[PDB]
Amino acid sequence: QVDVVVVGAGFAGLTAARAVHEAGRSVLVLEARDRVGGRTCTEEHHGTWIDLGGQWIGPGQDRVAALAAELGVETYPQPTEGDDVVLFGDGEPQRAPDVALAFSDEELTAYLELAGALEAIAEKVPLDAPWLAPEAAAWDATTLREWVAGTGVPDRVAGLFEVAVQAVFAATSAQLSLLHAAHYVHSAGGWSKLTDTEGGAQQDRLVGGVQPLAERLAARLPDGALRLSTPVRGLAQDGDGVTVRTAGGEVRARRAIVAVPPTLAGRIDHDPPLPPQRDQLLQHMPQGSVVKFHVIYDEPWWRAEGLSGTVLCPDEPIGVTFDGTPPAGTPGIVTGFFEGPAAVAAGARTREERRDVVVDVLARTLGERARDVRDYIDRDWSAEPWTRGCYGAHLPPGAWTVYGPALRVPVGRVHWAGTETAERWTGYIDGAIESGQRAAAEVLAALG
């Protein structure tokens, strides 16, 4: 019998396990995959790191910044220089030093006042209990899309906002409750924190990619504490402890931290069954839909033409791109995402068909040199059996107020972690770490 069994070796589970270990308690981490890092995943291709999962940290994210520095991982800045390209429907691509300046002054004002109005709502949503917002009943019964329509903003402003919503939530404004969206914005500290490079969540990358930072965190655990390729199938509990069932046998512990995406937490064979409010909360916490890609070129040819590599296309299957070129300056990489419906359509197609769609959008925005592609590497996180969608869960209307209060509440000896349980930077690596710190503190207090 160990003191704590942790299910999942994402940043949440590894953070929880290292905190239990450093407090001097015994811990076992059971991870389904043959690797740590979960929704962060780094592969070596073309002599550089390819982050197929989470890759960016920003200066409001104190826990991931501290962990990167603690474990000796260097950061590099997300390229900021060069013109952005904006494309609307059947129109001509517009170059501009910033995407802001491809709109009228009235449009930019309306966009910024829209963002300001969502932040006004967001500030009133308690980070620990969104269901206790004074207008929780109204806001949880409204989609974000209905709220956008009530502002009366023009089409091109609603369209620009929709690109940003899909890039942040991996879901459309019609899928999200306003209460969910507003909580998420509060959790990040504002709309510009979610959307911006400089000053925001996309400011910095890790030299060598993000999975190696998870490997360094796992290296703080003693030999034998981490079991890879060991999916948790069952979690039974009684008055004395918890019994974990794997294909390979049984693990006994005093307490458990389950640190997996909500959909996957509900699929475990719990004995006794989870209480109905928490089972149905997980039924109401669907993962997002994103396909992340890296288009590889021999060089970042767009830089020589004064382009940043960022395109913004509210009408295309790809909404937003970034220059993903490493500090060495080769190979050239354009990084981007299919989001929401576009992700589900693209996920049903082949890699070559997704490549063709991306290259076609880049050809019409960056230029026809985009068709001379060296390689194209992508990942549909919906098709990952141990994730079942990035970046994280969202809550549709009605879910936060009725089922939401069960989110973090322990069920006897089974405690909960995962970015979806964080108060600050929920949905990000930074919130995954927060959740592991919180769950570890709970379990250590409960052991006696």
Ligand X SMILES: *Cc1cc2c(cc1C)nc1c(=O)[nH]c(=O)nc-1n2C[C@H](O)[C@H](O)[C@H](O)COP(=O)(O)OP(=O)(O)OC[C@H]1O[C@@H](n2cnc3c(N)ncnc32)[C@H](O)[C@@H]1O
202 binds ligand A1ISO (CB under 6 A): yes
Which entry of ligand X, ligand A1ISO, Mg ion, none binds 354, CB below 5 to 8 A by partner kind? none
Tell which one of 418, 434, 438, 440 touches ligand X (CB under 6 A). Answer: 418
40 binds ligand X (CB under 6 A): yes
What is the smallest separation between the CB atom of 199 and a second copy, expressed in angstroms?
31
Which entry of ligand X, ligand A1ISO, Mg ion, none binds 320, CB below 5 to 8 A by partner kind? ligand A1ISO
Which entry of ligand A1ISO, ligand X, Mg ion, none binds 79, CB below 5 to 8 A by partner kind? none
**Cis, peptide link before residue 272, omega less than 30° from 0:** yes
For the beta carbon of residue 269, count every other beta carbon within 10 angstroms: 11
80 binds Mg ion (CB under 5 A): yes
Distance CA 103, CA 374 (A): 34
Distance CA 13, CA 232 (A): 13
277 binds Mg ion (CB under 5 A): no
Alpha helix ranges (H) inside 41-190? 62-70, 105-123, 136-139, 144-151, 155-169, 178-188
Phi, psi of 16 (to 5 degrees): -55, -50
Kindly write out the interface string for residues 243-282 of this chain, putting x where it contacts a second copy by CB under 8 A and - elsewhere.
--------------------x--xx-x---x-xxx-xx--
Which entry of ligand A1ISO, Mg ion, ligand X, none binds 195, CB below 5 to 8 A by partner kind? ligand A1ISO
Which residue lies nearer to ligand X by CB, 8 or 397? 8
Among 339, 378, 386, which residue's Cα sits nearest to residue 38? Answer: 386
Which entry of ligand A1ISO, Mg ion, ligand X, none binds 340, CB below 5 to 8 A by partner kind? none
Helix (H) or strand (E) holding 178: helix 178-188
Which residue lies nearer to a second copy by CB, 127 or 149? 149
Which residue lies nearer to ligand A1ISO by CB, 168 or 377? 168
Cα R_g (the chain), whole angstroms: 22
Are 425 and 431 a contacting pair, CB within 8 Å? yes
Among 347, 81, 76, 32, which residue's Cα sits nearest to residue 210? Answer: 76
412 binds a second copy (CB under 8 A): no
User: Interacting stretch for Mg ion, rule CB under 5 A, among 70-78, 80-88, 203-211, 430-438?
Assistant: 80-88
Among 413, 272, 301, 373, which residue's Cα sits nearest to residue 46? Answer: 373
End-to-end CA gap in the chain? 16
152 binds a second copy (CB under 8 A): no
Beta-bridge mates of residue 300: none
Which entry of ligand A1ISO, ligand X, a second copy, none binds 347, CB below 5 to 8 A by partner kind? a second copy
Distance CA 407, CA 391 (A): 18
Distance CA 75, CA 54 (A): 14
Say how many residues touch ligand X, by CB under 6 A.
40
Interaction site with ligand X (CB under 6 A):
7-13, 30-33, 38-40, 53-56, 231-232, 259-261, 264, 268, 290, 292, 381, 386-387, 390-392, 418-419, 427-430, 432
